[PDB]
């Protein structure tokens, strides 16, 4: 069984900035009191969202 | 069967059959903790 919809408007796709938002730990290596420079899939700062 | 391992800085979940021995402190020894093996002096520590 599934619910149903109608008069559902199309998505509007308005866009915002990921202002420094969404950093994450890129790997399982424990690090402490260090600076690590790394190439990975990150969401860029001020990316469109 | 393909066994895929990982050796992270995380609690040991599977181990080899090695017998285990008492701690020796303040002496230079070989050591093997969870397969992490080296040589040095073991002491109590203030580390958290
Ligand atoms: C839907 O999109 C239009 C432009 O395509 C925009 O003017 C409008 O504000 C959007 N809807 C909402 C609720 O923001
Ligand atoms: C998408 O990104 C570019 C540069 O990141 C920006 O100029 C543009 O304004 C963004 N999209 C919208 C709808 O503003």
PDB file of C-alpha atoms and ligand atoms in Angstrom:
ATOM      1  CA  UNK A   1       0.000   0.000   0.000  1.00  0.00           C
ATOM      2  CA  UNK A   2       1.205   3.498  -0.879  1.00  0.00           C
ATOM      3  CA  UNK A   3      -0.065   6.965  -0.115  1.00  0.00           C
ATOM      4  CA  UNK A   4      -0.724   9.298  -3.013  1.00  0.00           C
ATOM      5  CA  UNK A   5      -0.354  12.958  -3.934  1.00  0.00           C
ATOM      6  CA  UNK A   6      -1.709  15.523  -6.368  1.00  0.00           C
ATOM      7  CA  UNK A   7      -1.351  19.264  -6.862  1.00  0.00           C
ATOM      8  CA  UNK A   8       2.288  18.536  -5.991  1.00  0.00           C
ATOM      9  CA  UNK A   9       4.221  21.492  -7.391  1.00  0.00           C
ATOM     10  CA  UNK A  10       7.495  20.856  -9.220  1.00  0.00           C
ATOM     11  CA  UNK A  11      10.650  21.429  -7.161  1.00  0.00           C
ATOM     12  CA  UNK A  12      11.849  25.026  -7.289  1.00  0.00           C
ATOM     13  CA  UNK A  13      15.640  24.367  -7.059  1.00  0.00           C
ATOM     14  CA  UNK A  14      16.493  27.656  -5.319  1.00  0.00           C
ATOM     15  CA  UNK A  15      20.179  27.764  -4.387  1.00  0.00           C
ATOM     16  CA  UNK A  16      22.205  28.696  -1.302  1.00  0.00           C
ATOM     17  CA  UNK A  17      25.848  28.716  -0.186  1.00  0.00           C
ATOM     18  CA  UNK A  18      27.649  26.006   1.814  1.00  0.00           C
ATOM     19  CA  UNK A  19      29.575  28.695   3.683  1.00  0.00           C
ATOM     20  CA  UNK A  20      32.344  26.590   5.298  1.00  0.00           C
ATOM     21  CA  UNK A  21      29.599  24.032   5.917  1.00  0.00           C
ATOM     22  CA  UNK A  22      30.037  20.269   5.732  1.00  0.00           C
ATOM     23  CA  UNK A  23      33.627  19.337   6.599  1.00  0.00           C
ATOM     24  CA  UNK A  24      34.189  15.717   7.624  1.00  0.00           C
ATOM     25  CA  UNK A  25      36.949  13.333   8.691  1.00  0.00           C
ATOM     26  CA  UNK A  26      38.370  12.000   5.409  1.00  0.00           C
ATOM     27  CA  UNK A  27      39.897   8.755   6.729  1.00  0.00           C
ATOM     28  CA  UNK A  28      40.042   6.452   9.746  1.00  0.00           C
ATOM     29  CA  UNK A  29      43.615   7.388  10.711  1.00  0.00           C
ATOM     30  CA  UNK A  30      43.703   8.968  14.148  1.00  0.00           C
ATOM     31  CA  UNK A  31      45.593  12.274  14.154  1.00  0.00           C
ATOM     32  CA  UNK A  32      46.086  14.777  16.947  1.00  0.00           C
ATOM     33  CA  UNK A  33      47.623  18.232  17.345  1.00  0.00           C
ATOM     34  CA  UNK A  34      48.671  18.293  13.682  1.00  0.00           C
ATOM     35  CA  UNK A  35      47.780  19.948  10.395  1.00  0.00           C
ATOM     36  CA  UNK A  36      46.925  17.518   7.605  1.00  0.00           C
ATOM     37  CA  UNK A  37      46.741  18.548   3.953  1.00  0.00           C
ATOM     38  CA  UNK A  38      44.748  16.080   1.907  1.00  0.00           C
ATOM     39  CA  UNK A  39      43.140  15.574  -1.488  1.00  0.00           C
ATOM     40  CA  UNK A  40      39.679  14.060  -1.253  1.00  0.00           C
ATOM     41  CA  UNK A  41      36.043  14.552  -2.168  1.00  0.00           C
ATOM     42  CA  UNK A  42      34.995  17.519  -0.038  1.00  0.00           C
ATOM     43  CA  UNK A  43      32.152  19.955  -0.467  1.00  0.00           C
ATOM     44  CA  UNK A  44      33.962  23.175  -1.434  1.00  0.00           C
ATOM     45  CA  UNK A  45      33.438  26.248   0.681  1.00  0.00           C
ATOM     46  CA  UNK A  46      30.803  28.600  -0.706  1.00  0.00           C
ATOM     47  CA  UNK A  47      29.650  25.829  -3.019  1.00  0.00           C
ATOM     48  CA  UNK A  48      26.178  26.102  -4.516  1.00  0.00           C
ATOM     49  CA  UNK A  49      23.617  24.057  -2.593  1.00  0.00           C
TER      50      UNK A  49
ATOM     51  CA  UNK B   1      36.840 -16.684   0.326  1.00  0.00           C
ATOM     52  CA  UNK B   2      38.465 -13.253   0.266  1.00  0.00           C
ATOM     53  CA  UNK B   3      39.396 -12.010   3.729  1.00  0.00           C
ATOM     54  CA  UNK B   4      39.760  -8.227   3.760  1.00  0.00           C
ATOM     55  CA  UNK B   5      41.545  -6.808   6.800  1.00  0.00           C
ATOM     56  CA  UNK B   6      42.054  -3.436   8.333  1.00  0.00           C
ATOM     57  CA  UNK B   7      44.601  -2.523  11.003  1.00  0.00           C
ATOM     58  CA  UNK B   8      43.247   0.729  12.418  1.00  0.00           C
ATOM     59  CA  UNK B   9      43.915   2.592  15.654  1.00  0.00           C
ATOM     60  CA  UNK B  10      40.786   0.924  16.996  1.00  0.00           C
ATOM     61  CA  UNK B  11      40.045  -1.992  19.319  1.00  0.00           C
ATOM     62  CA  UNK B  12      41.271  -5.379  18.159  1.00  0.00           C
ATOM     63  CA  UNK B  13      38.419  -7.568  16.929  1.00  0.00           C
ATOM     64  CA  UNK B  14      40.253 -10.632  15.581  1.00  0.00           C
ATOM     65  CA  UNK B  15      43.634 -11.861  16.787  1.00  0.00           C
ATOM     66  CA  UNK B  16      46.175 -14.539  16.041  1.00  0.00           C
ATOM     67  CA  UNK B  17      46.677 -17.394  18.490  1.00  0.00           C
ATOM     68  CA  UNK B  18      49.716 -15.978  20.326  1.00  0.00           C
ATOM     69  CA  UNK B  19      50.098 -16.721  24.009  1.00  0.00           C
ATOM     70  CA  UNK B  20      50.360 -13.646  26.206  1.00  0.00           C
ATOM     71  CA  UNK B  21      52.888 -12.793  28.895  1.00  0.00           C
ATOM     72  CA  UNK B  22      53.243 -10.602  31.965  1.00  0.00           C
ATOM     73  CA  UNK B  23      54.217  -6.955  31.666  1.00  0.00           C
ATOM     74  CA  UNK B  24      57.868  -6.045  32.186  1.00  0.00           C
ATOM     75  CA  UNK B  25      58.419  -2.392  33.079  1.00  0.00           C
ATOM     76  CA  UNK B  26      61.454  -0.123  33.398  1.00  0.00           C
ATOM     77  CA  UNK B  27      63.507  -2.621  31.372  1.00  0.00           C
ATOM     78  CA  UNK B  28      64.369  -2.561  27.697  1.00  0.00           C
ATOM     79  CA  UNK B  29      62.282  -5.328  26.118  1.00  0.00           C
ATOM     80  CA  UNK B  30      60.761  -6.465  22.900  1.00  0.00           C
ATOM     81  CA  UNK B  31      57.008  -5.949  23.009  1.00  0.00           C
ATOM     82  CA  UNK B  32      53.971  -6.916  20.956  1.00  0.00           C
ATOM     83  CA  UNK B  33      50.626  -5.259  21.719  1.00  0.00           C
ATOM     84  CA  UNK B  34      47.830  -6.407  19.405  1.00  0.00           C
ATOM     85  CA  UNK B  35      50.461  -7.050  16.754  1.00  0.00           C
ATOM     86  CA  UNK B  36      51.942  -3.585  17.185  1.00  0.00           C
ATOM     87  CA  UNK B  37      55.489  -4.706  17.932  1.00  0.00           C
ATOM     88  CA  UNK B  38      58.714  -2.892  18.633  1.00  0.00           C
ATOM     89  CA  UNK B  39      61.352  -2.504  21.285  1.00  0.00           C
ATOM     90  CA  UNK B  40      61.658  -0.008  24.095  1.00  0.00           C
ATOM     91  CA  UNK B  41      61.057   0.624  27.779  1.00  0.00           C
ATOM     92  CA  UNK B  42      57.511   0.328  29.115  1.00  0.00           C
ATOM     93  CA  UNK B  43      56.340   2.493  32.015  1.00  0.00           C
ATOM     94  CA  UNK B  44      53.105   3.690  33.510  1.00  0.00           C
ATOM     95  CA  UNK B  45      52.000   6.974  31.987  1.00  0.00           C
ATOM     96  CA  UNK B  46      50.033  10.145  32.630  1.00  0.00           C
ATOM     97  CA  UNK B  47      48.539   9.900  29.138  1.00  0.00           C
ATOM     98  CA  UNK B  48      44.795   9.972  28.630  1.00  0.00           C
TER      99      UNK B  48
HETATM  100  C1  LIG C   1      10.271  29.392  -7.374  1.00  0.00           C
HETATM  101  O1  LIG C   1      11.133  29.839  -8.430  1.00  0.00           O
HETATM  102  C2  LIG C   1      10.986  31.220  -8.799  1.00  0.00           C
HETATM  103  C3  LIG C   1      11.979  31.479  -9.908  1.00  0.00           C
HETATM  104  O2  LIG C   1      12.087  30.358 -10.774  1.00  0.00           O
HETATM  105  C4  LIG C   1      11.201  32.120  -7.585  1.00  0.00           C
HETATM  106  O3  LIG C   1      10.907  33.465  -7.945  1.00  0.00           O
HETATM  107  C5  LIG C   1      10.323  31.699  -6.416  1.00  0.00           C
HETATM  108  O4  LIG C   1      10.656  32.461  -5.261  1.00  0.00           O
HETATM  109  C6  LIG C   1      10.513  30.221  -6.115  1.00  0.00           C
HETATM  110  N1  LIG C   1       9.639  29.797  -5.034  1.00  0.00           N
HETATM  111  C7  LIG C   1       9.930  29.983  -3.742  1.00  0.00           C
HETATM  112  C8  LIG C   1       8.921  29.471  -2.760  1.00  0.00           C
HETATM  113  O5  LIG C   1      10.960  30.543  -3.385  1.00  0.00           O
HETATM  114  C1  LIG C   2      26.205  28.609  -8.743  1.00  0.00           C
HETATM  115  O1  LIG C   2      27.626  28.820  -8.538  1.00  0.00           O
HETATM  116  C2  LIG C   2      28.236  29.969  -9.141  1.00  0.00           C
HETATM  117  C3  LIG C   2      29.673  29.971  -8.677  1.00  0.00           C
HETATM  118  O2  LIG C   2      29.881  28.999  -7.661  1.00  0.00           O
HETATM  119  C4  LIG C   2      27.486  31.232  -8.754  1.00  0.00           C
HETATM  120  O3  LIG C   2      28.036  32.326  -9.479  1.00  0.00           O
HETATM  121  C5  LIG C   2      26.004  31.100  -9.064  1.00  0.00           C
HETATM  122  O4  LIG C   2      25.322  32.270  -8.625  1.00  0.00           O
HETATM  123  C6  LIG C   2      25.417  29.876  -8.370  1.00  0.00           C
HETATM  124  N1  LIG C   2      24.014  29.724  -8.714  1.00  0.00           N
HETATM  125  C7  LIG C   2      23.099  30.678  -8.511  1.00  0.00           C
HETATM  126  C8  LIG C   2      21.701  30.344  -8.933  1.00  0.00           C
HETATM  127  O5  LIG C   2      23.389  31.759  -8.011  1.00  0.00           O
END
